[PDB]
Structures are given as C-alpha cells and as structure tokens.
C-alpha cells in the first residue's frame, strides 16, 4: 500500500512515480507500442508473466503504470489497472468475475450507461444483473444466490444522489462469499474510500473528477486485496491454474490478483487500452484532485443553500442537507462533503428547468460531470433516454428533474448567474 504513511495530499502528487536515468522530473509520455527485450529469454519471460517488465502497450505502459499505483494509493487499495474509459473499466471489472449464465446484484440508482450495459448488452451475452433498491441494505440479500458473484453499487447515485450503507452491503455480500464492487466516480478517494468500508474493488471514471477539465477519458480499477479467493471458492478462473498462462493461479498473486487478471484476460483480449497521453493528463489531474474537490464541495455548498432558499425552487436533492433522507449516511461516510453533483426540480416544472438552462451564462449545456467548468442538463431527455418510464422513474429521473455539476468558478458569479436566470423563468 502506502509505504512511509503519507497523507492524501502527498500521495496524489508522488504515488507510483519514480525517476528514470534521464532525471526527468515529470513522468514521460511513453507513446510507444512495444518494448525491446534484453534477449530471447526475457521476451519469453515477460510474455509468461514470470519476469516483471514491459510487454506490449495494450498490456503495459510506463506512463499508465504510475496511474495504476497512484489511484490505488489514493483509494487506499492494493493494486490498480487503467482502461480506455470508465465504461470499459466497468465492463472489464464485471467480466473478470462473471461468466455466461451467471449473474450479479446491482443497485437501482445507476448512470444511464452503467445501467444499459448491465441490462441490454452484457445480458445479450447471457449475464443479467438484478436491480435492487439500495436504500434498504437487506434488499440485496433477497435477490442473491449461487449464480451471484458480486454486489455492485455507485458510491453516489446518478441522478439519485442517494447514499448507501457501504459497510452493510459489504458484509451482506461476504456472508454469501462474494465481493463488493463500488463505482466511486462521483465520490473520489478524497471524499470516500469504499475499499475501507466493506468494498473489495472500486471502479472510477477518471474521465470525470480525476481528469478535472473534461479533456481526457479513462477508467481505473482498484482492488483492496482483502478477500480470500480460495476460501469463498465461488471464483474458479482464480483457483484453476491458467493453461494459456503456464498454469498460473491468479489467487497466488495476493493483493494483485483481481487486477493482474483483468490485464491478462479481458484487457489483453478485448483491448480497451488507454493511450499514454490520456494517462499523462490524468497524472496532472491527480496532482491537484484534492484541491479541486475541496472547492467543488465549498462551491456546491454555497450554491445549494442559495438554491434551497429561492422561492422558484421546488425541491433539491443533496445528502449533506440536514433534512435529506440520507443526512445520517452522509455524516457517517462522507466527513468531507458529498460531492458537487446534485439534482433539483423547479416550481414551473419541466418547461421551467429547460428555460433556466436557456438563460444561464456560466452553466454549460452538455453531457458530463466534474468539469472545472460548471454544467447543467435535463437527464430524462439525454443521459438516461435509454430507459423507459419503467426504469426512468426507478432511478429517480422525473420530467422536472435538472442536474447540476458545480465547477470551480467563483461561487458569487455562479450564484449571480443562477439568480439572473431564475429571475426569468
């Protein structure tokens, strides 16, 4: 994990970065695809996974490697692996422990994407996921069984902005001998470390917060390295020596089991590999993640207060709020804030929200979150237009719903902009 016990701010700046022979203080962009092997042994050794080193950029990259380590350090885990996007980090994570005919138990509150994947695409492939209501931790136990291999939820609903009892669902899963995978995109390691509250694997859509400016895509998978793969016995690929990899037992890697299996199977075969550039820009984003998340909260705090007190605001979801049905969860798991993404409904309903959008100057109309620039959009008509009233209202998406992602601009300017706009709907 973290060697000389460094604090978050130090880890987000140094984690997994070494200095090569050139003395280059910044991580070089290893925009290469292959690596020269010392001799014919090392070649066979690297491809056999028995000799530590670079192999192929689809599999390995000195730049991307620093991201794996660094994110893991922040997430306080044991090993990380990066991928083309968040969607791919999810697809890989799932496929690593779910075969055909098997199933997984995932929360009702999910990003339009994560959802339409679990339900339409990966099922089509014979892996259906049973959607439970995250508000009642026990609600998962009811759909669990023998074909179930992992309990999946999002650290903060998208757009349900609903918290969940991490520790509860973690045991409910371990009691049945399966792992807890938490999609921490919305919370980030600075706000919450699912791996330290009952989670085994944490996925991220670095595209959003880790990246920081809406310029780069990428996903990350971090493992806690705290789940006996043999014990539970429910994960064969992990137990049964791999013929294709020289009878290697993934469970023998320990803290690196889950991640070295994605890299050697899913990643190598499906190839949703990140480009060294993207990884570079992620390293820059991480070098300031905390600082930006800190402002993302204090800004959202101020913007939420002003919005709650405005007559023209019907309702406002935001766990930290003293009267949100999740306030208690917030205080227990999110001591530093609940993010900067929130939903709200206006008093003039649907036509009013879109109207507000059409008047704001500092809020951009687009599909994204966690940009340094503030954003707003109406989920139902976009990011979740892949779900019918059936799932739509099941994930909290109502015709009057409007979503906001608070940037790092000046709170006064954002409030002023919001004011002038509402003063016209």
């Amino acid at each position: 994990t973290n060697p000389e016990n460094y604090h978050f701010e130090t880890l987000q700046v140094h984690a997994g970065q070494t200095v090569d022979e050139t003395g280059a203080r910044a991580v070089p962009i290893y925009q290469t695809t292959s690596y020269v092997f010392k001799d014919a042994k090392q070649a066979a050794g690297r491809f056999a996974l028995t000799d530590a080193g670079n192999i192929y950029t689809r599999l390995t990259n000195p730049t991307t490697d620093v991201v794996d380590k660094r994110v893991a350090a922040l997430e306080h885990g044991t090993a990380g692996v990066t991928l083309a996007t968040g969607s791919a980090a999810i697809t890989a994570a799932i496929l690593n422990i779910a075969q055909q005919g098997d199933e997984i138990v995932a929360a009702n509150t999910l990003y339009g994407g994560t959802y339409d994947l679990f339900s339409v695409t990966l099922k089509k492939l014979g892996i259906t996921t049973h959607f439970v209501d995250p508000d009642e931790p026990a609600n998962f136990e009811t759909a669990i069984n023998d074909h179930t291999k992992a309990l999946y939820v999002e650290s903060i609903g998208n757009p349900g902005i609903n918290l969940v009892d991490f520790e509860a669902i973690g045991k409910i899963a371990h009691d049945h001998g399966i792992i807890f995978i938490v999609d921490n995109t919305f919370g980030t390691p600075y706000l919450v470390r699912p791996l330290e509250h009952g989670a085994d694997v944490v996925v991220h859509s670095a595209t959003k917060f880790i990246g920081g400016h809406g310029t780069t895509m990428g996903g990350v998978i971090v493992e806690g390295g705290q789940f006996d793969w043999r014990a539970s016995g429910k994960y064969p690929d992990f137990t049964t020596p791999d013929p294709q990899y020289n009878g290697l037992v993934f469970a023998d890697l320990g803290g690196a089991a889950f991640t070295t299996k994605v890299r050697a199977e899913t990643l190598r075969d499906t190839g949703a590999t990140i480009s060294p550039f993207n990884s570079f820009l992620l390293l820059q984003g991480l070098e300031s993640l905390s600082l930006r998340v800190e402002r993302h909260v204090t800004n959202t705090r101020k913007i939420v207060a002003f919005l709650k007190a405005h007559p023209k605001v019907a309702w406002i979801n935001y766990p930290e709020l003293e009267d949100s049905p999740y306030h208690d969860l917030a205080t227990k798991y999110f001591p530093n804030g609940v993010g900067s993404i929130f939903t709200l409904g206006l008093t003039g309903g649907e036509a009013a929200g879109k109207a507000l959008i059409e008047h704001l100057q500092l809020f951009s109309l687009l599909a994204n979150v966690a940009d340094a620039k503030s954003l707003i959009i109406h989920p139902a008509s976009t990011t979740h237009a892949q779900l019918n009233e059936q799932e739509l209202l099941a994930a909290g998406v109502t015709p009057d719903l409007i979503r906001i992602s608070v940037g790092v601009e000046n709170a006064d300017d954002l409030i002023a902009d919001l004011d002038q706009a509402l003063a016209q709907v």
Copy 2:
C-alpha cells in the same frame, strides 16, 4: 464512397478532412470529452441519434471521425468506426453480430491474440468459434449452420503468411446468408481491398501499418455496405427496432448500418474508445501509408531473395515467391506485393534462430510488426505462447520458426546486417 473518384494517394491525404472556421489546415486534436448543445432540443436530438453532430467522446470525436472516413475511403468501403486498439475493433465487430449461444467460423491461421479471444474469452461468454483450415475454401462450409452468423479470416496469416481465396469464402458465406469479415491488418488497403473481393466488413489493427512507427494504438472497422440485412434475416438486432434508441432500425441506415450499430451498442456500452491523440497520429501515418508500404514491399523483396539464396536458411515463407503454395493466390489478389512480414526457419534450427537474433544490430527484438524500424522475434516463445502444441502447430508455429517485419531502412544495410549475423550462427 469516394466522391470525385480520386486515386489512393489522393485519398490517403484528403479523405474525410474538412476545414473549420479557423482555417486550420491540419486536423485539430479535439482532446475534449463533451460538446455544448445549441438548446435542450439538440441535446435530446443528438442522444436520440436523430440529429447529426457530436455527442460524447466515447461515441464521437471530430478528430477520430476523419479516421473513420479516411480509412473507409482507402478500404473502398461505406463507413468506418475507430476503437481503442485492433483487439477491440475485433471484439466489437464480432459482438455486433454474435449473441450468446451463437457461433462464428474463423480460419485456423490467426494472430495469437485474435485467437485466444475467439477461443478462451468470448466463448467463456458463450460464443465459440470453429477454426477451419483456410487453404481449402470449402472447408468452411462443413462447419457452417444456423447459429453461424459470419465467416472470419486474416488477409495474411500471422505467422502462417498464408493467402486465402477471398472471393471463394465470400460466396460460401453469402450462400448461407452470412457476412465475410476480413482482418486486413497485414495487407492494408494499398495491397488488398477485401471489401471488393467478397468481404462485407474489414477490420484493421491501425497500431501496425496505419500508425507506421510503433507509437500509437488503435483499431478500425469498415463496412462495404453491400449486404441486405433484411434479406438474409439472420441478424435480428438489425431488424427489430431498438427500444433504447427510439425504435430505430439499424438496417434503415444502409451503408452505415454495421458501423453505427457498433458505435451505439458495443462502443457506447463497453467504451473501448480511442484517444483523439492516437487518432491524430493515425491521420499522420495515413498521410504516408502508401509511400511506406511501397518501400516495405521492395525492401522485403530484396531481403527475401538474399535470404532464400543463403546456405544457412532452411526454408522461407513468402507468397509472392514463385514456388510458395500460394503464388497463384498472390498474383490474383495481391498485384502490388504481399506485404513485408515473413517467416523463415534456419538450418541450425531453434537455437540458431535465437542466435541470429542475438547478433543482428538493425533488427529489434520485440512484439510488433509494421514499424518503420525492422523487427524480429520467435513467435512460439512469445506472441503465440498462449497456444499448446495442439493449436501452436495448427497455426504454423514450429520451434525453428522466426518472424521478420521489414522496416524502411536501407535494404543494403539490412542485408549487410543479416549477412554479418548469419555469418556467425
């Protein structure tokens, strides 16, 4: 397709590139993740796929778009889509027309990767692929049936360096109402256009030739737009309106059917999206593809002749050679050459090849092909060490086999380097 009927050299330089309002002569790197929508309608419109424009970089990118068009133009197809890597362009291509419990008929001669994917990973997902011997076009018909939805082969075996009767297998597939997907990595549009000899879809690993210098990864999928999806009837997802996409019938797009379905399903859900940088470097590579491939052939020609005449060379595979079991295929389908990748066996067997490797100065020991720098490696101990003697000798990988990828250096220097080295094994 190609509007004012331009020749290959003109298309590889201009295809799908327009000039924006800035006047920028070079395609800008759109290192962005989202796009600002005009109003709430356009947002809903883009996400509904009813309004042409950018949506999300996982789905769309102005830079990557030029690659889609450009490659397609060269491949002489109707529509292209790019992806994170070649492996992902393959995974996506397959998943676009193969559900669970279904199967596909693919050649025995395949890249270590393409293979271990079709066989271990995608089966695990309940899609097994029956490996036929490409030498006998009829050999495919025997394993075809009702669950079969596509016939897949590589334009040039890796490392079988075996040609195949494109037109033969194309009909053998259309007679049974399925499509022909040809992995043209090794041949490229300048040497062969599978789409014009019985192929419906062509996949590429731009990582290799299109890229040109071993710096960038990426895959491409191009469709010929010449297969009635309704007629054959064997492709439901293409016939049955998509609920998630507003009851859209993929077959209604025509020339853009196959590609807009990968982008809207597999890509959007699995997210093996290319980074705008990678796409940029591909555009540069394409702007010179032909010129480099031209030298790749004339260089390999000269290097093959010298190698055939050297006493210490046991055997040498290279279709163009007057006595290779494929010479006739070569003359019919490859009028401009058969590439620059070839295999050879030495007279001192295994230990001799690796020895040759350990002596060469201008040939680099690594896992890659089509680099401007020349490369050599022993497949059995690396790129195909995922197959047992069973598949290993089934794809032409023998203990004395050595593979070479001819660069663009000076033929005399390469021959000289090879000479001095052989003069020591």
Copy 3:
C-alpha cells in the same frame, strides 16, 4: 473592454478567452497546425497586411495559444497578451520591442540568473546596456535614468533574495521620465499581485513555473496594461512612425494592443520564439486551477516557514511576510493574499550545511525549477546563478550559504516531518 460582465479571478481562470467552435467541443481543441487556408487572394493578403483579423501562420497566430493570451491578460487585468516559447523568450521580446541599438535599460539587481545574464551579456553585445540598480530604494532608479534609458525592469519577488519592491513608487519615477515599467510577475502570479494595476505598463511571466503548475510544459506570456501614452512620451518612435513593411501602419494606433501587437508583428515574427499549441493546451489546463493551486502553495509555505524559523539549525530565513523582514511593510500593502511559495534560507553550518540538507530530504527534489506541484530545493550560487560571480552574485542576494526552497502542494505535515529528519542528519 477588458473583463466584460465583471467576473472574479476563479471564473476568469476557467473561462476567459474560451469560445465554443462549430464542433461544439467544450474543451479547447489542440490546433497542432502550421498554416491556415485563406478565403481568396484578398483575405490572405489582408491578413498578412494585418488589416484582417484571423489566423495567418502558427509562428504568429494560433487558436489554442490565443485562449492563453486572452486568459492570462484577463487575470493580470490587462488589455492584450501575446504568448511565447518560454519565460526567457517573453522577456527578450518585451525588451527588444522597445529597445534598439544604443538604448539602455535600468533593472533591479535581484534577477533570475537567466534574466541577469541576458541584460548583462547577451543584450550588451547588441548595443543595449543595462544598469543594475538596488531595488530597495526607489530613488536609485532615477539616478541611472537618462535619454537613452527606455524602460525600468524589476521582478515582483527577487529570484532569489525574496525582496519586494515599491511598485507605485518605481512606477511614478518611470512615468515622470516618460518611460515604461516592466515587471516580471513570475513568482507572484496574477493572483497575488497584479503589477499592471499598481504602476506597471507591461508584465511578463514564465508560465513554465506557476501557470503551468507541474513542471511539465514551458512558455512565456507578455501582458500590456494599455494605459500608457506612446505618442505623448515620444521616446518610442516605432510606435508612432508608420511601419513601411506594414503599409505605413502606426502601432500606437492599436490602443490597448499596441505593445503586444508590436511583438507579434515584429520580434516574434522575425525571431520566432513560438510556443507550440500543445504546450498552450497544457497551460490552459494549468490556468484552470491557478487560484486553487497558488492558494495551497501559500498556506503550505506559511506553516513550513514558521517551523523553519523556530528550528535551532536555521541561521536565517527570507520570507517578506515574516513579521520582521525588512520588506514586511511592502508585503501588507501589495500582497494581501500571501507572498508566494519561494523562499531562501541560510544554515548555521554554511554552504556545507545547506548542501547536506538538500541531499537528505525525501520530499524535496533537487532540480532547477519552481512552482512545481512537487516541492523543490536547490543551491542557487552553484547552479541557477553560476554565470554571475561574487560581485554580481552578491548584488542579487546570492550567498554561498543560501539555499532556495519551492513549496509544493503536498501535505504540509509530511513536508515538515521530512524537513525535520533531514536537519537532524545535518
């Protein structure tokens, strides 16, 4: 003009100069191009004539770099900006823009090693003499001014030496003699002090350091305040006398864009110290967090300066904000948000003690840079200022026992802990 709807720093550093093209792309595209297609022969001819606004040649204009120009100027509260390859190039251009052969410049003794040697050796060879004055006494500049003097140069915070200067004072003394006031605001950044609003006419920057923020990309920026009469003073003819090469165009006629437009059209076009659109993109990213980053570098440096002052093995510690530094008054008047994150320090054991301290710290990297997100430490006299020797070395506050530290954005405690252990091993 300037900042339209009167926005605050945090909003400008994130939005300033950034429009949405037809592609609708939210992030600024990286325009890695060298040329631009012109509408017919006239648009082409009119652009090259500088009469038609638009792109011409990346050596002169770039859509990506353009956002940098606007944004940086916006933050620095100026009217126009032009960016260049490095901080050194921005400085070289600023001078050369208003300095011919036979002219002279009066500059502070406290200057970064490069800047010094540029004024003293490189520009000397071309008939541009520079008088190095002691910035502590504003009147000292008056003494060296004369007919050939054409500009007064100072740094917002000496490098090294950490000495502040009376902006308004030197500002007046310069305008009273009809010359411009050039401030190299590198160490301060627009967020700590805006020299253009306290008597300065042109402010240059080394985006390499703070603006970029991670030690990964290089570039310089020149920003003009556009509130200095070029005609009036009369000492800047090129700004008044029509430019033959440019259809008799008179640069002073451009108003708020006179100085920078002269650089782009003269010095920049001809010498070509051009930034690459890539770098510009990375700078934009940096600017998008400038305020947040500069904020921590300071809170961090404050604590670390405290600890280091109380520590027995510390001979002395320069940091203007310290209640008794000979510049404290200048700090309160001009630097309400802090005095940055770069300070010098002397050790009890002299030089050998310092070099010992460097080699033992684990969170401070020994390299030549400042403003990195990572913390840095180095010994100025043997590196950054080794082209000067002792007389000029000592004219800028560089003593053999001097050690320089650049506080990063890591955890303040860890940094102190690291500092402790190293000092004990000294």
Copy 4:
C-alpha cells in the same frame, strides 16, 4: 565520430540518435518535463558548469529533442546539432552566435520573406548590417566582404525564385576571407543536397516544412560541419577567449560541437527559442519517412512541371531541373536526386490570371507553408514577401504575376487533372 558503422540515409533517418532506455520502450518517449533531478549538489553544479554531460533544464536540454539534434545532423552529414522552436529561431540563433554589434553579414537577395526582413529590419536595429548580393555571380560576395563581415548566407533554393547557387564557389570565397558559409537547406533537405559537404560550415533548417512533412508541427535545426578552424581565422574571438560566465571555458575547444554548443550555452539559454518535446516527437516521426516522402514530392513535381510547361496559358515556369533553366548546370552538379518540390510560375494573364488559378483549384490549398503532404499554392508578393516592396521585392525574383506551388504527395494524375480544369476556368 559522425556516422559510426557507415549507414545509408534510409537507415539513419529511422535510427540515428535513438537509444533504448531502461524501460525498453522502442519509441522515443515524449519527455514533457521542464527540469531533471540532479545527483547531489555537485552533479547539479557540474551540469550547470557544462563540465558534466546530462540534462539540465528543458530550455537547454531534452532527451526527446536530443534525438532530433543527432538524427538531423547525421542525415546532414555533420558533427553536432541543436534544435529550436522554429526555422526563424534557428536562423536568428545561427547569426547572433557569430555576430555582435557592429558586425555585418553578406547574404543572397533571394531569401524567404521572414529571413529577409530579419536581416534587413530586425537585426539592423541591433547593429548587425546585412549586404544583399546577387547569388548568380559568386564573385559578387567578394565585393561586399570586409573586416566587419563575419558570414556569407544563402538558401539552397531561393524562396521564391527557385535559384541554385555555386556552393563550392561561395564556400571558397568565404574561407579565403576566413569567414563561415551558412546555408538555409530548408527547400532541399539533407536528402537532395548536403551543403556541409560542398563548402558550407553551418546549415540551418525549418523542420516545419519538409522534415515535419504534414504542416502540423514547427521547429528549426542548426547543424555544424565541425571542419572550420575557429582559432585560425581569428575573427571569432568568443570561440577562443575563455568564457568568464562558464569557468573560462573556450568554446573552440569543443571541436565538432563548438558552434552548436555555443548556441545552446549562449543565445538559446538567454533568448529561449526552445522547442517543445511534443513537437520534437512529431519531428522524429517525420524524419522516419523523410527520404520516402521527399522522393515522391519530386517524382510528382517532375510530371506536374512537364504538363505546366506545355500548357498554353502558362507564361513561364521556374524549376532548375528543366533542360533550359539558367541554373540547369548547377542542378546536375549539386542535385543528383532532384531539385525539390517548390516552383514558381507566371501566367499569361499576369497577376489576375494567377489569383484566378488559385481560387479554382480543388487539390491545392491556399495557405502560407511548403512541404506539406497536401499540395499548396499562393501568391508571394501579397503575402509571404509583403514586408518588402518592389525594389527589394524584385531583388529576390518576386514579380506581381508570380505564383508559387508546393507539390504534395497526392496522386500525380489527380493533381494535373485539377490543374487543367482550373486553367480552363482562367
């Protein structure tokens, strides 16, 4: 020294200066960094002292850019190279490296618009006078030489004007007077003519054009032949007299790296026209195909020049290789592989005919650049050389009816077809 195991152009452009780091990465890493961690206080001090080889500061040294230096020099068959931000910056540095105030340069009249105005306006202001001679008669240079003259400058192929020059001739005339011969080989590239091997001492390049090859990235390269006695001639003191700032180091003591090492240590460090490691990476990619690309640009231009000569509506066509151009002899002697892909042409209808032709072609883009993979066309007098007017305009072969064309690597037939249709519409 130079090219070790005697390799050919195609092998050098792909391998020259590229090593494999510990990561084993085959492709040259992009070192997007500004500084480098130094081993203890001495390595640091020794690097800054220029006595310890290694990286110092990206403004001075970069592992990515370094491959560019070696490689380009290798191809140009020289001993040492240094790269800079642009072609203009490489030229500016080359001159300033051997030119002080009060010195003069004698250069060809045929110069790219920028180069001209740099010599004539920008460098004039700094006491560096340049005498513009007629390159057609080598003796013409002798006439302007004198005590203050310190270098003879010419382009391998005038821009525009497409005029060749007697390399060896001007080379001797310059060494007979103890001065260097500087050639701007942009238009030719090391693959068509290697000025360093035919009487030249320093050859500069605008990688922006051919080396890069796609109009996407900018940069300049300076290459020295290292076969000119600095001590002997005696006219280059700075090369002989110990450098105080550098521990009395004498630049001439460096041998084959004297000229370029002076640029990196003086002009470059102080003015900072530094390339970005990104650009360098893109240049390396370009170099990896230079020979192949230059080969087609020529076969293509040959055909296109033929067609255009026979065409009725073509008043005249400049291309040295043409059997009757006043430079054909120079072409056969010096350019055995072709004379490039940039030619000028006059139309029967004069200026208006030309500008008409431009606006009608579909495969030729109207922009300011050459050597793109895409074909280009432009009218020099209203753009690239509009800072010069008629007297100096006409001293470089730029006539109001002149049209310039840069042949790309598209299909030769399509280009001709496109040209036909446009001419008919004229």
